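On clarity, I found the account of how folds are encoded harder to follow than it need be. For illustration, here is how one protein appears when written out as sequence plus structure tokens.
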Amino acid sequence: CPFALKMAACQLLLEITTFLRETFSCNYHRNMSWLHVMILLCNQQSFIHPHCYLHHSRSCARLVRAIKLLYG
């Protein structure tokens, strides 16, 4: 699967986490399984290309534009 789909999943996880930390603060809210994975996703990049952060950002922007066009 492409990087952009992974970032879409990351956005979903972000919404999950913000909901959990904005509702339980008014255990699940004390430990999170996916955080480590996120760390890996942040470190699994080339900062020197096939897996450079520039290419990933371009792909993400392309997917965002495609989604905007589809939902237009």
